[PDB]
Design a protein around this motif. Structure first.
Motif, PDB file in Angstrom:
ATOM      1  N   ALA A   1       0.833  -1.186   0.000  1.00 52.21           N
ATOM      2  CA  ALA A   1       0.000   0.000   0.000  1.00 52.21           C
ATOM      3  C   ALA A   1       0.877   1.247   0.000  1.00 52.21           C
ATOM      4  O   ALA A   1       1.897   1.322   0.683  1.00 52.21           O
ATOM      5  N   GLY A   2       0.472   2.229  -0.802  1.00 49.92           N
ATOM      6  CA  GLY A   2       1.244   3.451  -0.942  1.00 49.92           C
ATOM      7  C   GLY A   2       0.356   4.675  -0.825  1.00 49.92           C
ATOM      8  O   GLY A   2      -0.865   4.573  -0.649  1.00 49.92           O
TER       9      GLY A   2
ATOM     10  N   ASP B   1       6.262   7.419  -4.671  1.00 51.43           N
ATOM     11  CA  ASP B   1       6.666   6.126  -5.237  1.00 51.43           C
ATOM     12  C   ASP B   1       6.232   4.999  -4.288  1.00 51.43           C
ATOM     13  O   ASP B   1       6.122   5.197  -3.066  1.00 51.43           O
ATOM     14  N   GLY B   2       5.957   3.839  -4.880  1.00 48.68           N
ATOM     15  CA  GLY B   2       5.457   2.689  -4.138  1.00 48.68           C
ATOM     16  C   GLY B   2       6.168   1.399  -4.501  1.00 48.68           C
ATOM     17  O   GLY B   2       7.036   1.380  -5.384  1.00 48.68           O
ATOM     18  N   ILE B   3       5.810   0.341  -3.782  1.00 50.04           N
ATOM     19  CA  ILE B   3       6.396  -0.996  -3.954  1.00 50.04           C
ATOM     20  C   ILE B   3       5.281  -2.021  -3.886  1.00 50.04           C
ATOM     21  O   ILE B   3       4.403  -1.948  -3.030  1.00 50.04           O
TER      22      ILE B   3
ATOM     23  N   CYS C   1       6.802  -9.059  -3.878  1.00 46.75           N
ATOM     24  CA  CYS C   1       6.648 -10.448  -4.296  1.00 46.75           C
ATOM     25  C   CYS C   1       7.947 -11.185  -4.083  1.00 46.75           C
ATOM     26  O   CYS C   1       9.003 -10.635  -4.360  1.00 46.75           O
ATOM     27  N   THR C   2       7.867 -12.401  -3.531  1.00 51.55           N
ATOM     28  CA  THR C   2       9.043 -13.251  -3.386  1.00 51.55           C
ATOM     29  C   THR C   2       8.776 -14.614  -3.981  1.00 51.55           C
ATOM     30  O   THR C   2       7.630 -15.044  -4.061  1.00 51.55           O
TER      31      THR C   2
ATOM     32  N   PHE D   1      13.975  -4.936  -9.050  1.00 52.49           N
ATOM     33  CA  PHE D   1      15.302  -4.839  -8.421  1.00 52.49           C
ATOM     34  C   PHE D   1      16.196  -5.876  -9.087  1.00 52.49           C
ATOM     35  O   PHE D   1      16.284  -7.021  -8.653  1.00 52.49           O
TER      36      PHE D   1
ATOM     37  N   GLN E   1      18.455  -8.187  -7.221  1.00 53.15           N
ATOM     38  CA  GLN E   1      17.867  -9.047  -6.175  1.00 53.15           C
ATOM     39  C   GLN E   1      17.047 -10.199  -6.736  1.00 53.15           C
ATOM     40  O   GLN E   1      16.586 -11.054  -5.987  1.00 53.15           O
TER      41      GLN E   1
ATOM     42  N   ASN F   1      13.632 -12.109  -5.179  1.00 54.02           N
ATOM     43  CA  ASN F   1      12.927 -10.869  -4.939  1.00 54.02           C
ATOM     44  C   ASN F   1      12.372 -10.335  -6.257  1.00 54.02           C
ATOM     45  O   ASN F   1      13.122  -9.821  -7.086  1.00 54.02           O
TER      46      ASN F   1
ATOM     47  N   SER G   1       9.895  -8.023  -6.404  1.00 53.42           N
ATOM     48  CA  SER G   1       9.156  -6.814  -6.060  1.00 53.42           C
ATOM     49  C   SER G   1       9.260  -5.762  -7.129  1.00 53.42           C
ATOM     50  O   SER G   1      10.273  -5.678  -7.825  1.00 53.42           O
TER      51      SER G   1
ATOM     52  N   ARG H   1       8.812  -1.715  -8.258  1.00 49.30           N
ATOM     53  CA  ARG H   1       8.781  -0.288  -7.924  1.00 49.30           C
ATOM     54  C   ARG H   1       7.802   0.423  -8.859  1.00 49.30           C
ATOM     55  O   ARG H   1       7.874   0.247 -10.064  1.00 49.30           O
TER      56      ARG H   1
HETATM   57  C1  LIG Z   1      13.636  -6.531  -2.623  1.00 47.33           C
HETATM   58  O1  LIG Z   1      14.841  -5.763  -2.668  1.00 47.33           O
HETATM   59  C2  LIG Z   1      14.650  -4.389  -2.352  1.00 47.33           C
HETATM   60  C3  LIG Z   1      16.004  -3.700  -2.456  1.00 47.33           C
HETATM   61  O2  LIG Z   1      16.842  -4.063  -1.378  1.00 47.33           O
HETATM   62  C4  LIG Z   1      13.970  -4.117  -1.005  1.00 47.33           C
HETATM   63  O3  LIG Z   1      13.624  -2.741  -1.068  1.00 47.33           O
HETATM   64  C5  LIG Z   1      13.046  -2.126   0.091  1.00 47.33           C
HETATM   65  O4  LIG Z   1      11.681  -2.479   0.168  1.00 47.33           O
HETATM   66  C6  LIG Z   1      11.019  -1.827   1.225  1.00 47.33           C
HETATM   67  C7  LIG Z   1       9.638  -2.461   1.346  1.00 47.33           C
HETATM   68  O5  LIG Z   1       9.844  -3.826   1.578  1.00 47.33           O
HETATM   69  C8  LIG Z   1      11.015  -0.329   0.926  1.00 47.33           C
HETATM   70  O6  LIG Z   1      10.237   0.352   1.907  1.00 47.33           O
HETATM   71  C9  LIG Z   1       8.965   0.693   1.343  1.00 47.33           C
HETATM   72  O7  LIG Z   1       9.110   1.852   0.577  1.00 47.33           O
HETATM   73  C10 LIG Z   1       7.912   2.166  -0.121  1.00 47.33           C
HETATM   74  C11 LIG Z   1       8.247   3.309  -1.077  1.00 47.33           C
HETATM   75  O8  LIG Z   1       9.107   2.675  -1.997  1.00 47.33           O
HETATM   76  C12 LIG Z   1       9.564   3.486  -3.076  1.00 47.33           C
HETATM   77  O9  LIG Z   1      10.290   4.619  -2.660  1.00 47.33           O
HETATM   78  C13 LIG Z   1      11.480   4.408  -1.947  1.00 47.33           C
HETATM   79  C14 LIG Z   1      12.236   5.744  -1.876  1.00 47.33           C
HETATM   80  O10 LIG Z   1      11.627   6.675  -1.008  1.00 47.33           O
HETATM   81  C15 LIG Z   1      12.386   3.359  -2.583  1.00 47.33           C
HETATM   82  O11 LIG Z   1      13.402   2.987  -1.670  1.00 47.33           O
HETATM   83  C16 LIG Z   1      11.629   2.140  -3.097  1.00 47.33           C
HETATM   84  O12 LIG Z   1      12.519   1.261  -3.793  1.00 47.33           O
HETATM   85  C17 LIG Z   1      10.427   2.586  -3.944  1.00 47.33           C
HETATM   86  O13 LIG Z   1      10.795   3.336  -5.095  1.00 47.33           O
HETATM   87  C18 LIG Z   1       6.753   2.464   0.840  1.00 47.33           C
HETATM   88  O14 LIG Z   1       5.530   2.634   0.134  1.00 47.33           O
HETATM   89  C19 LIG Z   1       6.587   1.293   1.810  1.00 47.33           C
HETATM   90  O15 LIG Z   1       5.632   1.606   2.816  1.00 47.33           O
HETATM   91  C20 LIG Z   1       4.502   0.712   2.775  1.00 47.33           C
HETATM   92  O16 LIG Z   1       4.765  -0.609   3.281  1.00 47.33           O
HETATM   93  C21 LIG Z   1       5.098  -0.629   4.653  1.00 47.33           C
HETATM   94  C22 LIG Z   1       5.462  -2.080   5.016  1.00 47.33           C
HETATM   95  O17 LIG Z   1       6.563  -2.526   4.226  1.00 47.33           O
HETATM   96  C23 LIG Z   1       3.920  -0.088   5.480  1.00 47.33           C
HETATM   97  O18 LIG Z   1       4.184  -0.170   6.878  1.00 47.33           O
HETATM   98  C24 LIG Z   1       3.625   1.346   5.051  1.00 47.33           C
HETATM   99  O19 LIG Z   1       2.539   1.947   5.768  1.00 47.33           O
HETATM  100  C25 LIG Z   1       3.346   1.349   3.541  1.00 47.33           C
HETATM  101  O20 LIG Z   1       2.166   0.611   3.275  1.00 47.33           O
HETATM  102  C26 LIG Z   1       7.921   0.904   2.446  1.00 47.33           C
HETATM  103  O21 LIG Z   1       8.396   1.910   3.312  1.00 47.33           O
HETATM  104  C27 LIG Z   1      12.452   0.185   0.958  1.00 47.33           C
HETATM  105  O22 LIG Z   1      12.524   1.582   0.692  1.00 47.33           O
HETATM  106  C28 LIG Z   1      13.251  -0.603  -0.076  1.00 47.33           C
HETATM  107  N1  LIG Z   1      14.677  -0.343   0.027  1.00 47.33           N
HETATM  108  C29 LIG Z   1      15.407   0.012  -1.031  1.00 47.33           C
HETATM  109  C30 LIG Z   1      16.877   0.220  -0.811  1.00 47.33           C
HETATM  110  O23 LIG Z   1      14.928   0.162  -2.147  1.00 47.33           O
HETATM  111  C31 LIG Z   1      12.728  -4.996  -0.811  1.00 47.33           C
HETATM  112  O24 LIG Z   1      12.328  -5.078   0.559  1.00 47.33           O
HETATM  113  C32 LIG Z   1      12.929  -6.434  -1.283  1.00 47.33           C
HETATM  114  N2  LIG Z   1      11.628  -7.108  -1.277  1.00 47.33           N
HETATM  115  C33 LIG Z   1      11.428  -8.401  -1.042  1.00 47.33           C
HETATM  116  C34 LIG Z   1      12.579  -9.264  -0.751  1.00 47.33           C
HETATM  117  O25 LIG Z   1      10.290  -8.935  -1.044  1.00 47.33           O
END
Ligand SMILES: *[C@@H]1O[C@H](CO)[C@@H](O[C@@H]2O[C@H](CO)[C@@H](O[C@@H]3O[C@H](CO[C@H]4O[C@H](CO)[C@@H](O)[C@H](O)[C@@H]4O)[C@@H](O)[C@H](O[C@H]4O[C@H](CO)[C@@H](O)[C@H](O)[C@@H]4O)[C@@H]3O)[C@H](O)[C@H]2NC(C)=O)[C@H](O)[C@H]1NC(C)=O
Length: 115
Positions: A11-12, A17-19, A22-23, A70, A73, A78, A80, A82
């Motif tokens: 959820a975003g 930007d959001g994510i 998926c694994t 990614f 990854q 991974n 997932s 973006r």
């Molecule tokens: C696969 O590999 C990647 C790279 O290491 C990991 O990346 C991290 O993933 C987490 C989520 O698991 C990221 O945190 C999330 O960021 C979201 C925004 O993402 C975008 O913007 C940021 C920059 O500001 C980027 O870093 C990102 O890549 C995207 O472009 C938020 O929307 C998320 O919040 C939501 O989810 C959380 C729970 O996870 C809730 O609590 C919130 O309320 C909300 O719903 C979250 O914060 C993190 O930024 C990523 N790091 C990097 C370095 O990119 C993945 O985790 C990994 N995934 C696998 C293995 O499944």
């Protein structure tokens, strides 16, 4: 469903930007892995990654210029996605579809968007 694919709650916020998470059951060689992301009711793909790179020739217009995986990854399972500058129109049911050398699998995800 010959390999395991799992999503987790994603959820975003609109305008940010959001994510989509998926694994999957990791494979040994990057060349054997295909990731496809689909959105319910959408004609083109959300994203495709195959032979170690993006393949977006069949990508839907609603996602042009807005998606990335990614690539570093994928080898560790991974898949997932973006999503750039999330919009209320991005809300809905998505499917993460995976092929590896060991088989195929998929899982759905409900992506939520909010102010
Ligand atoms: C696969 O590999 C990647 C790279 O290491 C990991 O990346 C991290 O993933 C987490 C989520 O698991 C990221 O945190 C999330 O960021 C979201 C925004 O993402 C975008 O913007 C940021 C920059 O500001 C980027 O870093 C990102 O890549 C995207 O472009 C938020 O929307 C998320 O919040 C939501 O989810 C959380 C729970 O996870 C809730 O609590 C919130 O309320 C909300 O719903 C979250 O914060 C993190 O930024 C990523 N790091 C990097 C370095 O990119 C993945 O985790 C990994 N995934 C696998 C293995 O499944």
């Amino acid at each position: 469903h010959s390999i395991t694919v799992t999503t987790v709650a994603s959820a975003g916020n609109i305008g940010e930007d959001g994510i989509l998470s998926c694994t999957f059951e990791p494979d040994i060689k990057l060349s054997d892995i295909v990731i496809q992301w689909l959105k319910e009711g959408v004609l083109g793909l959300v994203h495709e990654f195959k032979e170690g790179k993006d393949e977006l020739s069949e990508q839907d217009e609603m996602f042009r210029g807005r998606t990335a995986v990614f690539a570093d990854q994928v080898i560790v399972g991974n898949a997932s996605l973006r999503l750039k500058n999330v919009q209320l129109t991005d809300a809905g049911t998505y499917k993460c579809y995976i092929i590896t050398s060991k088989g195929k699998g998929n899982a759905n995800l409900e992506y939520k968007t909010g102010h």
